[PDB]
Ligand binder design. Structure first.
Ligand SMILES: CCCCCCCCCCCCCCCCCC(=O)OC[C@H](COP(=O)([O-])OCC(O)COP(=O)([O-])OC[C@@H](COC(=O)CCCCCCCCCCCCCCCCC)OC(=O)CCCCCCCCCCCCCCCCC)OC(=O)CCCCCCCCCCCCCCCCC
Ligand SMILES: CCCCCCCCCCCCCCCCCC(=O)OC[C@H](COP(=O)([O-])OCC(O)COP(=O)([O-])OC[C@@H](COC(=O)CCCCCCCCCCCCCCCCC)OC(=O)CCCCCCCCCCCCCCCCC)OC(=O)CCCCCCCCCCCCCCCCC
Ligand SMILES: CCCCCCCCCCCCCCCCCC(=O)OC[C@H](COP(=O)(O)O)OC(=O)CCCCCCCCCCCCCCCCC
Ligand code: HEC
Ligand code: HEC
Ligand code: CUA
Ligand code: CUA
Lengths: 51, 331, 233, 143, 154
């Protein structure tokens, strides 16, 4: 209970403030059949101070 | 009335707090009020006397000390006296109603031939005055001045229907404002400034009332008269025009709203400033010639107070007013 | 076209709003804020939904029957826009205000369900805390509340997100972009306009409605049946 | 019930006469400080007020021509005349309070305009009214 | 209880980035004062100077500065009573129409960016002929044309 994700900023890692884009997985279908992919998407996204 | 009050301290007592009035019909209303109060005082004392007689004369201890016995005469009916006492108030209210009709009809008659007509707009919560027509004597041009603004009033007439079509109220839009008169010479009242309408002395004047929002009322205590301003006065079958035969003396006079309109009903004051007839021509020519100039600048052009001396604007902060200094310093 | 529209805007503004906003939109000390820079969208939202004029200072303004029509609303918005601009209305490709074309990033003629999924997760992230899961509204501190979203059209939703009317935070078009906003509109309208598969929805207020229904009337009917079948002595 | 059946004829005729006088007056008198034209509010009220009093008077008279010389109306009646059963009167009942509460619930329902409150209020209201009307006729407990 | 002298609807300010200065009793008010800095790097000062001096002492904005640094602005007419001088960067100023009825005037602005940061706050100093007015203002980007921009991943 003493820790969280932000504990990584304890002089180890650069940690951005990531906003949630709520992106779903994206479907892809062909002769092999319909399957869902998350290879081209990202739910968390960085943000500039003018947003 | 054509007959003046008793005057003196008796008149002051009978007044009893009315302003003296500054128009002919104000004088008429004041005189009628004074004599009606005389008659009312007669009735009041001549019945309080009978109640006092009951308190002191018709007491039971006196009559029992006098030996009258346990009971009085037990009279119940005196029909002739009852009929006389019934006939008396009939005649009193009848003869009162005659003079009531007289004074009322000379007040309300719309045949006073205005030289000036001012369109007045009431809105939540301030007044907007606009000079509608001015006779050639006072107008800048020699010919009669007509103040209706063509473009802005054309917008008002175009608002009647077809905002892409709703038209619920008898075929017109619910937000119709074609009943409002928009004029090019206007004084606009604000929370930062008390509006002041400038009028001349000794001219028949006309007021044309209307209301953008809920019902208001125009009350000048020095006219001893007030009239309700309604939205769509024609639709309400309400008479939106009233005329004063003249104003008889110059000065600044407060005027208030006398109809419960909403939250800031108390803050809705205006001023009616009556000025020399020769100065009114200067005022109207100044306002017409350089319309960008404010009302205060025109009042300075006359050579009188740029702002309403009768009442100052209320402070608009809801905490600062606690110590009783709720008055804004106009200058 | 706008130059003459601004005149009607001024005429309407002078006759209603000065008492709270001043002749020059500077505001008044405690009676109303300044309107410099709010733009067309804030005026459209406030007037078209009928929130303005506010005739009583309260914990919060109220939606009600609007005091002006559409053209008058756009006229007043044009007049206010002439004093500093601000966020603007979302005009469609032909110039009309966008309605039914904001329902999803990928709108063609019907609500795309992928947009509904993304908008549902977005609404749950941002909007559903003050409103509820399906936008039935919610309560706040000291007499304020978040309204039920069934009343607003799509333009009102967009300008609400854009302007942050009273206590609603602003959601600029670079925090929640147009695709995100349109997916949110799609989710709102889908939840509004879809019947519940499981019968009468009980308002979708959650456990409270279901509780009240059963624990009062459902048990009452069964004790009535018991009284039918049993005895009173 | 003779005197009260017939004393109602004064108010109703006065109201009817005032209604016709007022309709002619407002439709003809073009006085300043007012607008000519018949007003329907007020005239409708006056005629239907005359209607209310006329309904009362005519029903009472139509009834009174049937009844006998009741001792309460006989100016020299004795207390022995009215000996017998006066009638049936409710001793006690909880249902007036119940249906007052039901009407209150319905009124609150239309205040906020929650439709379920209106429906439940109407249901509860007719239930309480029915229980009021069946109070002295509920069947004995069927064994 | 909510309709008292202290009320939630009465204390509110506009939902805008621009700060404001001046009471109802002050002669000249500045509303919506903000430092704009578009993504393309150009910058300026948005504001609206409203004159309400009851003495009718028409003023002329002599200068404006941000942290003491100059901001360019020209063709500023005097502001007589009940008039508004709206100032903004030229690109944003082009988006709205100048009103032919009313006293408003539009004026363009521009300043060289010394390195101001988005999010921060910087002082702004106005000086008119009748005196100086100081007010802190935030730095932010102008508003997008609403509805045109999508979240782009890369
Ligand atoms: C005003 C605010 C308070 C609420 C209104 C007053 C009370 C209403 C309920 C009275 C019920 C009743 O008869 O109680 C008798 C009962 C006493 O027995 P009793 O008078 O000998 O019974 C004679 C009859 O058997 C009694 O008749 P019954 O045997 O047919 O029983 C009828 C009883 C029971 O109900 C039934 O018999 C049917 C079951 C469904 C009822 C509800 C349907 C909806 O009906 C109800 O309880 C109806 C409730 C109505 C609520 C109205 C909205 C408020 O009263 C109590 O024990 C207390 C009553 C509640 C407190 C009242 C004061 C509160 C302050
Ligand atoms: C959802 C589906 C649920 C299915 C499971 C439950 C089935 C229950 C079936 C009904 C039942 O058990 O009735 C006997 C059961 C008890 O009867 P009981 O104790 O054997 O007989 C003595 C009476 O209750 C003594 O009360 P009462 O009958 O003299 O006066 C109350 C009156 C109340 O009646 C009304 O409120 C109806 C008035 C006429 C309205 C006409 C327009 C309707 C459209 O009648 C009733 O309550 C009986 C009729 C109930 C249905 C009326 C609709 O009735 C109730 O408890 C009903 C009371 C509440 C009625 C609310 C409506
Ligand atoms: C067969 C029968 C139908 C009745 C109404 C359902 C609710 C509804 O319509 O909701 C939507 C409805 C929303 O409005 P609508 O969609 O316009 O009808 O809800 C409300 O307006 C009412 C909200 C009620 C809040 C209740 C708070 C909690 C009460 C707990 C009571 C506990 C009692 C415990 C007793 C123990 C001893 C027994
Ligand atoms: C609490 C901090 C809120 C969050 C988060 C969001 N909104 Fe909201 N919203 C809130 C309030 C207090 C109000 C009322 C504003 C007023 O002046 O009355 C609103 C209003 C809306 C509306 C208007 C609804 C109407 O009936 O007109 C809409 C369309 C709306 N809000 C949408 C909305 C969305 C989509 C949000 C997530 C992006 C959102 N709001 C967040 C309070 C809060
Ligand atoms: C007082 C009598 C008012 C009148 C008349 C009008 N409005 Fe108003 N407005 C008033 C208050 C008390 C408030 C703050 C409370 C709130 O609901 O926000 C407002 C606010 C606005 C806003 C919001 C500004 C923002 O930054 O989002 C707008 C856009 C607005 N008012 C516009 C407006 C217009 C155009 C009016 C006349 C047509 C109008 N309001 C009337 C009080 C009063
Ligand atoms: Cu008023
Ligand atoms: Cu008023």
């Amino acid at each position: 209970l003493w820790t969280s994700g932000w504990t990584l900023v304890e002089n180890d890692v650069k940690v951005y403030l990531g906003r949630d884009t709520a992106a779903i997985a994206e479907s892809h279908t062909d002769a092999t059949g319909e399957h869902w992919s998350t290879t081209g998407v990202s739910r968390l996204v960085r943000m500039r101070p003018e947003d | 009335c054509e007959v003046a009050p008793p005057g003196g301290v008796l008149g002051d007592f009978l007044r009893m707090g009315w302003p003296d009035g500054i128009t002919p019909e104000a004088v008429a209303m004041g005189n009628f009020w004074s004599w009606v109060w005389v008659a009312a005082w007669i009735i009041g004392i001549i019945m309080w006397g009978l109640f006092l007689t009951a308190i002191f004369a018709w007491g039971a201890k006196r009559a029992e000390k006098r030996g009258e016995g346990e009971f009085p005469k037990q009279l119940q009916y005196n029909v002739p006296l009852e009929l006389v006492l019934t006939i008396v108030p009939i005649i009193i209210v009848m003869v009162l109603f005659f003079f009531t009709v007289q004074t009322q009809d000379k007040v309300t008659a719309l045949d006073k031939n205005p030289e000036v007509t001012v369109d007045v707009t009431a809105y939540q919560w301030n007044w907007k005055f606009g000079y509608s027509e001015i006779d050639g004597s006072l107008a800048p041009g020699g010919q009669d001045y007509q103040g209706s603004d063509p473009e802005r009033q054309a917008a008002a007439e175009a608002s009647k229907k077809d905002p892409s079509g709703d038209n619920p109220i008898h075929g017109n839009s619910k937000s119709d404002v074609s009943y409002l008169e928009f004029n090019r010479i206007e004084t606009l009242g604000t929370t930062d400034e008390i509006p002041v309408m400038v009028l001349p002395v000794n001219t028949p004047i006309e007021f044309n009332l209307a209301s953008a929002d809920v019902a208001h009322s125009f009350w000048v205590p020095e006219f001893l008269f007030k009239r309700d301003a309604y939205a769509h006065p024609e639709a309400n079958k309400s008479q939106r025009v009233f005329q004063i035969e003249e104003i008889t003396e110059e000065g600044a006079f407060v005027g208030r709203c006398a109809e419960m309109c909403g939250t800031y009903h108390a803050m809705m004051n205006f001023e009616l400033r009556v000025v020399d007839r020769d100065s009114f021509a200067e005022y109207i020519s100044f306002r017409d010639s350089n319309p960008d100039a404010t009302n205060a600048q025109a009042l300075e052009h006359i050579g009188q107070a740029p702002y309403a001396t009768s009442t100052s604007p209320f402070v608009s902060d809801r905490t600062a007013t606690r110590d009783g200094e709720n008055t804004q310093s106009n200058a | 076209d706008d130059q003459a529209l601004i005149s009607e805007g001024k005429d309407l503004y002078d006759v209603a709003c000065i008492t709270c906003h001043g002749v020059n939109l500077q505001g008044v000390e405690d009676r109303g804020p300044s309107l410099v820079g709010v733009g067309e969208g804030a005026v459209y939202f406030q007037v078209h939904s009928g929130r303005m004029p506010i005739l009583r200072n309260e914990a919060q303004a109220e939606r009600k029957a609007p005091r002006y029509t559409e053209a008058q609303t756009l006229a007043i918005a044009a007049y206010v826009a002439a004093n500093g601009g601000g966020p603007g209305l979302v005009y469609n490709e032909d110039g009309t205000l966008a309605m039914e074309e904001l329902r999803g990033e990928n709108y063609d003629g019907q609500i795309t369900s992928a947009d509904v999924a993304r908008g549902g997760d977005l609404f749950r992230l941002n909007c559903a805390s003050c409103h509820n899961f399906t936008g039935r509204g919610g309560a706040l501190s000291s007499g304020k509340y978040a309204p039920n979203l069934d009343a607003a059209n799509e333009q009102e939703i967009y300008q609400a997100m854009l302007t942050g009317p009273q206590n609603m935070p602003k959601f600029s078009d670079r925090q929640l972009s147009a695709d995100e906003k349109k997916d949110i509109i799609a989710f709102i309208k889908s939840t509004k306009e879809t019947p519940s598969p499981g019968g009468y929805s009980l308002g979708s207020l959650g456990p409270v409605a279901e509780g009240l229904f059963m624990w009062v009337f459902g048990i009452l009917v069964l004790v009535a049946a018991a009284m039918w079948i049993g005895s009173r002595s | 019930m003779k005197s009260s059946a017939k004393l109602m004829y004064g108010p109703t005729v006065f109201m009817a006469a005032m209604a016709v006088i007022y309709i002619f007056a407002t439709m003809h008198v073009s006085d300043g400080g007012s607008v000519k034209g018949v007003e329907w509010v007020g005239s409708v009220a006056l005629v239907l007020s005359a209607g209310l009093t006329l309904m009362l008077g005519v029903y009472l008279h139509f009834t009174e021509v049937r009844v006998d010389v009741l001792p309460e109306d006989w100016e020299e009646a004795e207390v022995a005349d009215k000996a017998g059963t006066l009638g049936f009167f409710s001793p006690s009942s909880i249902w007036p309070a119940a249906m007052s509460g039901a009407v209150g619930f319905l009124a609150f329902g239309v205040v906020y305009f929650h439709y379920w409150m209106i429906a439940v209020g109407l249901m509860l209201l007719i239930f309480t009214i029915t229980k009021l009307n069946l109070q002295y006729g509920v069947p004995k407990e069927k064994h | 209880c909510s309709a008292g002298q202290i009320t939630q609807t009465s204390s509110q300010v506009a939902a805008v980035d621009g700060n404001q200065a001046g009471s109802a009793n002050d002669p000249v008010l500045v509303r919506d004062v903000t430092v704009h800095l578009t993504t393309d790097g150009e910058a300026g000062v948005k504001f609206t100077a409203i004159n309400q001096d009851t003495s009718h002492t028409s003023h002329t904005l002599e200068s404006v500065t941000v942290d003491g640094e100059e901001v360019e602005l020209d063709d500023a007419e005097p502001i007589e009573r009940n008039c508004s001088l709206v100032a903004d960067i030229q690109s944003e100023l082009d988006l709205i129409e100048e009103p032919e009825v009313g006293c408003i005037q539009h004026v363009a602005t521009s300043l060289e960016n010394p390195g101001f940061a988005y999010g921060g706050v910087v002082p702004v100093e106005f000086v008119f002929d009748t005196g100086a007015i100081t007010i802190d203002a935030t730095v932010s980007a102008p508003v997008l044309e609403s509805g045109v921009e999508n979240r782009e991943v890369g």
